[PDB]
């Protein structure tokens, strides 16, 4: 099946530094990644797709890599309204193979 | 080579000597397997794919399965025993094939002995589906190197993929389920109902390349094949392929491409004669003779030269297509001129000169044969069917509007005093042979009623 | 099914006995109407189009006059009477017509019959003009809903719109000029002066598809056909189109696909004999017989296998392809063997054996027969034609590098042992049929002086 | 035209009268050049090319090689002497080219007499290699405006260069080699090894056009061709193309386009029957009768339609298809209908009833036929073959469910009360053919064994 490696669980990082959360699938799904944020109490907000396209309206500072098993998500000049929790998912679609899920989480 | 087909005499009648080509005929297949993806990669396009890609498979699906079962029925019925010495290959089950002809056996044996490196290569089966481009070539020990071509894949990565901001989802869907929906009419001519026996190795790859689009030369050139009778062995229909495993969940085959080397088959030759026109009785005619006649170890044939490339210098053919000659013609091809059979010229065009060893052999009664160098007319009687020009004759003659210079004939020195005879008219249209046949038969039944 | 064509002295003499398929044909057509844009919208790339579309309309009017003119030979000379209990149908204008074949007047009727939906159709002329969609649906009050393909429309919409940004006008101008030129290039070969009758439902769905690019699928999935001999209706070309309506000023066209459903003929089967070649006098030989042999109530007839599809369970037809046979054939077929004629082997390529009931019939004397249970060579005098290797014999026979299991003979236990008679040798080459032919008027005329 | 076809006699023996057309034959060429650049200007795109190009080069040099060859044989062995009163053309070297036919000589011919404006063309090599669009027009002094046509020019345009920010360098040059190796695959079908006799204009130009991707619109409507028979000459295959020039190192070809004209034979016309099926003995049956015959001068003679275009005015051929026609079968369409055979009907579906001058031609027996005026049946004797329906019998027939008002017959009154005398029964089947002739061969044994 399909399971995703989302590392680390939480993390510290003080305003203006950087962050980096990594996803790991278990099978190669050729760039097709997305990233969200959620906010407690709130519904997710699309960030990433396909790994390096950024969301309409959502800064620079949050920057995706990566292709096949392994996936970062850097996020750069933190502000204190970045807290929150970050998930990664799958959405591959070669046809044929069928690569689905959801990231552990990051806080 | 020599001559047994008494040329002079056949050329009085309107057959002019030809070109004598070799004879040439497929044997000693390389084998090179190779991976055809039947679907597309769109994962970069994932989101414009909607439920097309779930039709494609069930259709593709509904395509696939009858190969693979024929595939199965040898494939299930055919045991690898423990080698030994008692037995130095494997057994068939004829009760369980029930009927098949020889081919058909033969290349179960060949889909057997296809069947390891087929396994070797759906090792590679996870590999195979994460391909997403259209040529790719697949290493894991440097053993048995696995080439993957993929269908429609070049157009997903250079069509639909960079033009995906430009147009709009449903645009881009509909675009996608044309391109398939037009490959699947395209592939139906070669893998629908039409292949009936999968289980052959007769198929040529250029039929066999309609998965990849009918691009033969790429899937040819990505296994390695390079030889100078590479376009004289795919044009004469001599490289084929044979399909050796399908795969229904992951919708790709693999194919055994079987690449022949042309030999030439010695103490044989294929001669050629050019028609030519002849009159006789204030009338034009043609001999109904065969144009291409096989000549092995002294011996005439026909042969079926429809089914063979003709090069200049030699004929290709993928098999022996040598077929009976009976002795009336064989008699007339020896010489009896009056065994040859005539059929009358009524149409404006037709054949009325050759040009053989330089030497031309021209129905001047037809044609308005002039004489260039003497600045007078070359004129032909009734009584003689063709005339020989050369350079006793006239140096450069005039045939209509073509000045050609000749050469010296080697044959009898009276050959347009000398004359032969003329064989029995004929009628070679369809309906004129159902007409004669049964005027035939009245009449032999008049005569045995007489009788 | 039974056994009515002695299969036992068939063997004997090289014909083996071989799948026995069904005989089915079509039947029961569904009707569905769809229309074609011959010409592609360009209004969102219309400032590089210059005169193009101009040239193109010209050309295409030019195309499509004469369809028009051969429908409306036919719509202006059908009249539809007030319906009444006298009449139930439509007259046609036999004067009018003048000359036509029965087929053509029944295509006739069904234009006619077209004529409603295509009224229907034709109310939305304006939505038509105004599609800019490769593939659309219409709807209006939710009947007869009108499906529309357009050609080289997907072209215009992801090929040039999106690279209008990219490429000069003229660049664009030359590339939509050459697309269009491509299509008439391709267009021609269906819709040129070849399609002599226009009014006819004889035209294959395929052939009809090529006003869209050949994409067949498309055009029979919009319409929403489906059936498990979708793919069988399709390969025997059975599923035909009919031009019903052909505007020039919009340069459209409405086709009429018949659907048919495949019916198995009762009482009747097909079976299939496997030529093997047997030895006599030294020599080798195959017997001239029909190879596909047509029983339906138990009468022998002949078969054009050649305009159906063959698959492995049954016989496809768009037609009974029945034909007469003689009764010399159908006497060997009926055990004289005597009757059947037989032709010199000359080719190193001929089947050689074949398996039925999982009992091998070789010619022993050609190939190598090896018994591999008992380890000692089957040998075969030249007394015997064909040798029956079964489970009394071999287990497991050898024929060159196959290792076959056999089953057990069900006929003559003294198979080998009965022999039969050899029919008279013949030569199916057609100058040589013509020679033969020729030689027998000189024989009967002989014999004829004499008397 | 008259009749001399005896058609009353004609269709008691189920042959219609149908239309009459006119004959009409290629003529009077009008001929202009143009170059085809075989490999297209990636300059734009130089970074992504990688290795491609040189493969390809070699290749195509490969497959242009033989065509070059064979054309020097003819140039190198043409010379054209100083022009005078003496001589008014060039010479062939007979002995040089040492065997040929007349077409090839002619062709030869015709390559010498292109040989100037090739020259004229060659003279804008460097030119014609920088061109980097699909359609290119050459001038330098308004002289013979060369028109250039490159191969793939229009994909690097519109579909590499556009693309070539959106995808990787790797991508694009892989979409470059399947390009190129998929034009390889289309243009091997024509210019491989099957293009054996190079001098020759008589391929097509839909065959030549496969080295512009089979856009033969383009490459005809460029030169400027303008005629209402474009569509007739091109379907009858009577456009045609030479290569007089070919290029190794530019990779590029000329071609000559020979554009004729279609004359109407004078004084002859081509008529057809319409087959049907009449009733004799209890059974059906079919006359085995030419369905097409060619009458001029008032002279019978067999056609190969077969390689002509029919129409509904004309008969369209690229030559003179006449073929001679047996004594008995020209006794029968005289109106011998005891001298045309007949063949038995087995088949579900044959033709039963045709249309000719608004007279109805049905086998009453087979089908059923009803007169829609007097609501009475129309019934047809065992005695009688077909049966003539007519205004006198019946103003408005039903056959099946077509319902046709009729004229008045304008042969003999008692037509239905005749009668005739059938010719012999016979069988079309090849085998069966084979089968007949042993038999008679047979036949004619023992009778002259007796004598
Ligand atoms: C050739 O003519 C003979 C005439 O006797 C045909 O022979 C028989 O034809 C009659 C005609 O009705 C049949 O009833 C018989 O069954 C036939 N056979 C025998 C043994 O008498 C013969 O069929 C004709 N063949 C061809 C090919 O035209
Ligand atoms: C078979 O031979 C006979 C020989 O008598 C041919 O019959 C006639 O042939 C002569 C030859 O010039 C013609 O002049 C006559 O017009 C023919 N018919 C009659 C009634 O005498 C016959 O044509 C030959 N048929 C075939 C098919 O070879
Ligand atoms: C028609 O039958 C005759 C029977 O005499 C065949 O004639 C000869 O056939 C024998 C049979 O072995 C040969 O040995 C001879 O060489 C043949 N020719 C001569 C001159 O005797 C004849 O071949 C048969 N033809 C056809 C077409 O069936
Ligand atoms: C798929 O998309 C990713 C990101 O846009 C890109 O890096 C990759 O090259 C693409 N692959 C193909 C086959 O187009
Ligand atoms: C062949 O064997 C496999 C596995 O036993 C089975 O799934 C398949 O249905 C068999 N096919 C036939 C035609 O017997
Ligand atoms: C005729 O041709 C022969 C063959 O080449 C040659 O040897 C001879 O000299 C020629 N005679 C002439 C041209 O007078
Ligand atoms: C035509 O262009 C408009 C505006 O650019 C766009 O909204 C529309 O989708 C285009 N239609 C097609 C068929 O390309
Ligand atoms: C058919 O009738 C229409 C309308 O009367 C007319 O325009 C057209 O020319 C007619 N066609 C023929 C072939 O008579
Ligand atoms: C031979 O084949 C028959 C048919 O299946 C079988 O019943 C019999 O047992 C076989 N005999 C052997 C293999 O000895
Ligand atoms: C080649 O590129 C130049 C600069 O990008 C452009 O001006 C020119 O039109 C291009 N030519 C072709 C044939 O694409
Ligand atoms: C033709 O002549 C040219 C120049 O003399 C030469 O290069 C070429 O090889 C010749 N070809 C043949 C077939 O003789
Ligand atoms: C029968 O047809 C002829 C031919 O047009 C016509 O002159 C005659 O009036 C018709 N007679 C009828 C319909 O009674």
């Given at each position: 099946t399909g399971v995703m490696t989302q590392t680390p669980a939480s993390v510290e990082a003080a305003v203006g530094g950087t962050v980096t959360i990594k996803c790991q699938a278990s099978?190669?799904?050729?760039?097709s990644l997305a990233w969200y944020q959620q906010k407690p109490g709130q519904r997710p907000k699309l960030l990433?797709?396909?790994?390096?396209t950024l969301a309409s309206?959502?800064?620079?500072?949050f920057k995706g890599s990566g292709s096949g098993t392994q996936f970062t998500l850097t996020i750069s000049?933190?502000?204190?309204?970045?807290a929150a929790t970050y998930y990664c998912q799958s959405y591959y679609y070669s046809g044929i193979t069928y690569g689905n899920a959801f990231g552990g989480g990051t806080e | 080579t020599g001559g047994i087909l008494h040329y002079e005499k056949l050329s009085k009648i309107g057959l002019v000597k030809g070109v004598t080509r070799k004879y040439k005929i497929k044997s000693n297949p390389l084998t090179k397997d190779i991976v055809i993806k039947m679907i597309p990669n769109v994962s970069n396009m994932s989101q414009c794919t909607g439920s097309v890609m779930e039709n494609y498979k069930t259709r593709l699906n509904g395509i696939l399965t009858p190969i693979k079962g024929a595939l199965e029925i040898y494939k299930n019925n055919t045991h690898d025993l423990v080698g030994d010495v008692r037995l130095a290959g494997v057994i068939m089950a004829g009760v369980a094939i029930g009927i098949a002809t020889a081919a058909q056996i033969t290349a179960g044996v060949a889909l057997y002995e296809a069947m390891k490196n087929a396994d070797n290569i759906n090792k590679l089966k996870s590999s195979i589906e994460s391909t997403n481009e259209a040529v790719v070539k697949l290493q894991e020990?440097?053993?048995?190197t696995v080439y993957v071509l993929t269908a429609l894949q070049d157009y997903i990565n250079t069509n639909l993929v960079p033009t995906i901001d430009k147009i709009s989802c449903k645009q881009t869907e509909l675009s996608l389920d044309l391109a398939l929906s037009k490959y699947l009419s395209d592939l139906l001519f070669v893998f629908?109902?039409?292949?009936?026996?999968?289980?052959?190795?007769?198929?040529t790859i250029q039929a066999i390349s309609q998965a990849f689009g009918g691009n033969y030369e790429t899937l040819l050139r990505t296994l390695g094949y390079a030889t100078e009778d590479f376009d004289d062995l795919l044009e004469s229909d001599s490289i084929t392929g044979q399909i050796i495993y399908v795969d229904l969940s992951s919708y790709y085959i693999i194919v055994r491409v079987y690449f022949p080397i042309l030999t030439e088959i010695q103490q044989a030759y294929i001669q050629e004669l050019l028609p030519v026109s002849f009159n006789n009785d204030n009338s034009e005619w043609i001999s109904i003779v065969p144009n291409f006649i096989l000549v092995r170890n002294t011996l005439i044939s026909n042969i079926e030269i429809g089914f063979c490339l003709i090069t200049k210098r030699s004929v290709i053919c993928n098999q022996d297509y040598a077929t009976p000659m009976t002795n009336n013609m064989r008699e007339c091809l020896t010489g009896?001129?009056?065994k040859c059979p005539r059929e009358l010229v009524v149409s404006?065009?037709?054949?009325?000169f050759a040009l053989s060893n330089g030497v031309l052999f021209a129905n001047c009664i037809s044609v308005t044969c002039q004489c260039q160098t003497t600045g007078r007319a070359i004129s032909q009687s009734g009584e003689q069917t063709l005339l020989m020009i050369d350079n006793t004759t006239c140096p450069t003659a005039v045939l209509g509007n073509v000045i050609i210079s000749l050469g010296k004939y080697l044959?009898?020195?009276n050959y347009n005093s000398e004359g032969i005879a003329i064989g029995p008219p004929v009628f070679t249209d369809k309906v004129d042979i159902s007409s004669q046949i049964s005027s035939m038969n009245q009449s032999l039944q008049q005569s045995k009623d007489y009788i």
């Open positions: 099978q190669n799904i050729i760039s990433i797709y396909y790994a390096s309206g959502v800064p620079s500072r000049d933190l502000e204190c309204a970045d | 020990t440097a053993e048995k629908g109902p039409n292949l009936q026996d999968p289980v052959s190795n007769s198929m009896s001129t009056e404006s065009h037709v054949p009325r044959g009898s020195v």
